Symmetry: D2
Subunit: 465 residues, 4 copies
């Protein structure tokens, strides 16, 4: 049958709210007001709002500001929200008012409805009780920084740690697997596949380092500053006490009150800082994934250096073809993180006076970047990196083929003559060794024995470990 | 509960009720990255194309009538959105969209298998006949994009432009002070400003339209690499003919070059730059409007915005410009999406750019956000705007820069001295001119008053 | 050694030999930020406009002949680049370009003061007559930008497109293996690929041309806020008339809306998106070319690039694709410049966008880099490219995916099994088909050989 | 008269080089090859190349690889280059080969020409001697990271420190200067001008923090890795010894050898990381500069909160008008840094195998961002921030005018009634105080004395210090 409504109200009047909804008047307005992307807060963001609302109620209870029956009912309802029992009750668009007033009221209203249908029913006012000592202006970006910290510490870093270990495992397994270095895409001097993969492992290690270095500021929460950062209508030390509860319940050691309470509301520069770390990682990952698909290019017309695990038929039309789908997923994610970074930057620069009103869009983009990076990193290990196989014979051949293996003769014959040696070898399809012989260079400056010691490609890659 | 399906890589457990098969199931397992799949508009576009392809194969005698008809019927179901739950593959799939192409192929086969009469079609040999993912998936993308441009954004933009033009006219004699550098300038009317904003949106429409020639190019018929191998002479022209007849999009066309259309997605980058420009226009229009609405008492107080919702969970009675906030945040998102599309576009290699799904995702999102926010910006903000005309008049008469039209009579340097004296002594411009002894051969009182008139000065 | 000049803020020490005056000197002191000033092209554009304005004031009887003639002569000197050392103000000046406008005004006055006969003109009252910085400086910007688009980039792009088209033709039967996802695909010809690249550049030209309608709009005549205060009826139309006659740029026009043209610089954002697209095209073309040239022995080895310089200070005899490196780095720069122009464009407030100098700087730089690198890309790279035809032929015949045209005879799944067997046993496709017993009712030997022909397969 | 040339040569043959030039064959080729932007290396980049070439020669001398006469002549010539005596001898475009081969050869050739015209002349070979133990692949990005570290530590940070001190000085001077907070551009609750400026000071302090947190990786130099990162043709410990010389001569404590020698050449992710710090600062600065020009907007039709120092006549046409030119310079710079960041990102993601060949473009953009930020920050202090004057009476009036001063009544009368109070006050142009009275709210929940204590605007801004 037809959609049913019950009446709710706010300070602007009465609103018809769908009968099955736990949200009330202000949420419903926002539903009518912002039907823009059709996407609302993520699971991670609803969880954070839930945890925060509970902690605030806890502290209000602790300080005698909110009666136990009310506080306990708000905390039980907030726990349910944290646990994901009410995600369908947050229908508000990402592209709502830029302070998140609407989503803050969403949480307030939902908690009130939950508390009213409990056993026994408990009446809490969405503003006076569930929002006691709070503004959207501290709580909504607090929930944002909390979720972002969580994603950094529990989601991305562990994934990156796992990717790094998988790369370092190839660095060790392939330490003496000689091949031709390539600079500018042209034949350079020998390296090992291991040394390359050690490179990649460091890119990822430095990525972990990058994420960590943002945490001291990504971790700052404005809770306590209420409307403008003055903390009006909040008790002394409210923010400190909320953060203490949140640190205890989440186990996130990096959460802290803001250094400056006006900076933490007038700006979301911490979100801009965190995005810069992930855009760096997108650059590292693009590089890594690219070298891997290039190395796996073929079977026959490419570089043919390594074999990637087959994951799915490559082509609706070319039968038998298999494609480096995982590196494609990695490089597409990197592109998304880069675009998201730019969206965060615009948001970040557009604050005015006491409030940056781009929190939902910045929240959306930063958290997405974290999720995509974390997920793609784990898949990159399990469905690509771990099962790579080196084509070792073909790789030694490549190493031996570069005319630039003449390079270690520089100290003996000089750069100019060595260049002539390389030009001649290649013009006459001769080996560097025979060309050296032919050009009359064996003598006091260079014996045959020195020439062979020096052209040894594995020796030339100078394996350190 | 699971059933076994197979592909050329072997056998795969697929959920029993699911209409997709082996290749789709692997994609579900391989790319759980974002948890978001193709949008409604993309699924629709895929369905229409698959029906179009089967129509052409049928017309040309390549695909038997029973098989073609079963595919056409099934693709129409997909197009109409009866099977969106049957497209579970992530956006962040293989960059050609092979997985989503096979997803359409597999789901069509399953629908056909249970139709009346039942008909067995092979996902590769029949439903993918004469096709590659490399031409069809960007064709569906460019089809979705052209549909969004023409039927969604342009109309929304036309609606916003009309609302602004309406204000340009309604407020044509509403004089106020111009501001340049944020400082008191000479007189303008609120209407002039809104005529400015209306042109920005009109120019936005021109900017979207200018991209259609290349945005509407579809690589269909180029198959695997652009050469048309395995497709018959004229497959593309004919599929595009069918798509124009069914969709009514006049802008669709075959690619000028069938290699450019698969090796690159430059038309998507081009489309995005149009959108990026509109983002910038909309940021400006929206900012001016929130600044004009600022107060009640501590800002500029030029106009009143329709109340849409309580502004503050803590500050009672306060109302906030929530709609210009939606707009400016949508603009930011479009700028981000543009950077993503840019990274994708520059990253092609040889016969295939393999960033189609991320490019497609970001371009289509910018379209929808812009179209949706634009309509709302009219109905919930622009239409209800109310000018505080007397306060605006007061502002127009308060700017010391109204001394400007005296330049030709007293010269810039003396006019500057008039301005500075007026300001420092808290005197009017007129009185300062008089005080400084400028009435005489230089300038009559009649002229002074004629030229200091703020409504004349705004030159409607 | 210094002399005293003054403005309405008071007296300023100016270097004695300098032709600029008080307002320019303050700008020199206020903005030592980048150490870079207006480019040659910008100074030229300013000079032409200032002469154009004096011409119109003269025609309309607003500026006496002696004064107008002195200004016209002086502005022509500036235009021809005889006084670039007299424009020392930083790019990062007041965002309206007031400082550079006064710089032109002051230098003109000084030139006029020492001309024959000598003529005293006032920088504000005479040389700036009927003008603001708010219309003239963006007019000069849009004039420079239109000049760069039409006389610099488009011709360079036409030159690159011709060089690519030449290769498209010269190499039309040079068969090689296609690559999609970086993996062995079906056959293409090198020419087809280069036809692809040529279309990208041809589409680039179309993309630049499509921006001219709005890029060539000049706010001239709108003066301080867009209302035309202090300028006579038709000042803009008339200045633009003169500029078209002198420059021969057919694309210059007055603004559709005189407020949009000063409140925003959206035409610059639009122009940049065109350039950004070209950056992406050029990255792709250049990458393919460096990858095709990769080796001598450890890469793909498809083509040889003209040697331009020793590649390595340490690796003797090595040569590197230095020109595609210049191109791809130019592309990056253009993408950056685009982000800068975007931040500028969205940041207008009321009657004036005050980011004109940074916008102007980045748009004009993208133009010059692209035009310059494009010409070089032809003369020092594309023209001299040499195809290794026999190696390419070997690649075309080596791809296991040449089994593809058998789909209609043996079906996708069997063809896949043929490919996999060929690869695993190191057998040819033809032999594998035979081995797997497929010759018969399905497929004759004559047909197998007809369809496996790589040059036919590329379908020229 | 006509341009004169002398003949030089490299391994590709003979080149005509302008007679007054100290560069030789390979530089001249690059001049003909890359006439793209018409801009070459900056003063900072030539200095770094000069310092590096000297240190390499020093270490080669120390280890017995290069004879004293040769080393001493290279070091004297390198010193002259470091000191800026030969900037006109680096004519090569930014948009040269992406490893900087050309600029590395530029330095090698110039040093050789200097050494030849010394007293007595000393012949050093540009490859064999001046480039001993080096590649462009380690030296050019070493000179880049060195210059970037220098700009961070000696240029930006000190400027930012100076901007921060100037902001904190206003934070203290204006601590009790009450005014109306603004959120969403609408009347909020009172703040002081000081609290706002404390916000800004923290944004800049967190910017210093951001720059510092990149240094451990921005400081890594690949010197020692030579061609591919294997250090072939370099002695054991070459990089360590060069860095030791460079640390001693520059006083830059943050310089260090690379953690992974292949990461430091295959990538310039450190440059991407440094750019992310500065783009965050661009966001902070845009915000700060914006609030300042808005506060200074007027004289009569704006917010009229503060007076900015006049720096120049504002308008060629509007006489007497003065414009916030410095904030305009700040916000334009911020835009440039943002665009530069994106150019760096593209470069950073585009590496292949053993070498990222986008070093010149990335170098160009990062260093520019540093210079512009450093210069604009110092001017922002001296020509704007330091001499700001608060319009204190007008600001108290603004504070007293916001209908949102009803906010501290929430705990006494409830959010809904307080909203009705604010709506009524404003509809009937009454004060919040009188409206409270009129609505019959003085009673047991709220005395007249409590109502006056609570509406006190300076008390409501809750000054902490």
């Amino acid at each position: 049958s037809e959609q049913q409504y019950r009446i709710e109200h706010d300070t602007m009047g009465e609103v018809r709210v769908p009968a099955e909804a736990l949200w009330r008047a202000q949420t419903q307005r926002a539903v009518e007001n912002f039907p823009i992307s059709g996407r609302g807060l993520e699971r991670t963001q609803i969880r954070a709002l839930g945890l925060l609302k509970g902690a605030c109620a806890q502290v209000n209870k602790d300080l005698g500001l909110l009666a136990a029956e009310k506080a306990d009912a708000i905390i039980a309802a907030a726990q349910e929200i944290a646990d994901g029992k009410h995600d369908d009750q947050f229908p508000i668009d990402v592209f709502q008012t830029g302070s998140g007033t609407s989503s803050n009221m969403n949480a307030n209203e939902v908690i009130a409805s939950i508390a009213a249908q409990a056993t026994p029913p408990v009446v809490v006012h969405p503003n006076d009780d569930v929002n006691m000592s709070q503004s959207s202006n501290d709580t909504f970006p607090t929930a944002t920084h909390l979720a972002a910290t969580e994603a950094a510490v529990r989601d991305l870093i562990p994934a990156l740690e796992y990717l790094q270990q998988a790369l370092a495992t190839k660095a060790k397994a392939w330490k003496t697997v000689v091949k031709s270095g390539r600079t500018h895409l042209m034949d350079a001097v020998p390296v090992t596949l291991g040394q390359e993969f050690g490179g990649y492992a460091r890119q990822i290690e430095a990525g972990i380092e990058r994420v960590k270095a943002t945490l001291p500021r990504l971790g700052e929460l404005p809770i306590g500053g209420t409307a403008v950062g003055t903390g009006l209508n909040a008790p002394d030390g409210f923010g400190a006490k909320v953060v203490e509860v949140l640190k205890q319940s989440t186990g996130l050691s990096e959460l802290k009150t803001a250094s400056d309470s006006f900076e933490a509301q007038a700006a979301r520069d911490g979100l801009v800082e965190g995005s810069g770390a992930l855009k760096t990682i997108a650059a590292s990952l693009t590089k890594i994934a690219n070298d891997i698909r290039w190395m796996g290019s073929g079977p026959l017309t490419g570089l043919g250096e390594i074999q990637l695990p087959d994951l799915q038929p490559g082509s609706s039309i070319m039968p038998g073809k298999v494609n480096p789908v995982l590196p494609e997923a990695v490089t597409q994610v990197a592109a998304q993180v880069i675009g998201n970074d730019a969206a965060i930057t615009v948001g970040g620069l557009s604050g005015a006076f006491e409030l940056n009103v781009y929190i939902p869009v910045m929240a959306r983009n930063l958290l997405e970047s974290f999720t995509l990076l974390a997920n793609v990193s784990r898949l990159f290990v399990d469905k690509c990196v771990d099962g790579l196989v080196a084509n070792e014979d073909h790789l030694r051949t490549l190493a031996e083929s570069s005319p630039s293996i003449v390079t270690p003769l520089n100290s003996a014959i000089g750069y100019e003559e060595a260049a002539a040696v390389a030009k001649e070898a290649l013009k006459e399809r001769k080996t560097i060794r025979q060309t050296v012989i032919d050009r009359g260079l064996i003598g006091d400056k260079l014996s045959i024995e020195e020439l062979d010691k020096r052209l040894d490609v594995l020796a030339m890659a100078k394996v350190k470990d």
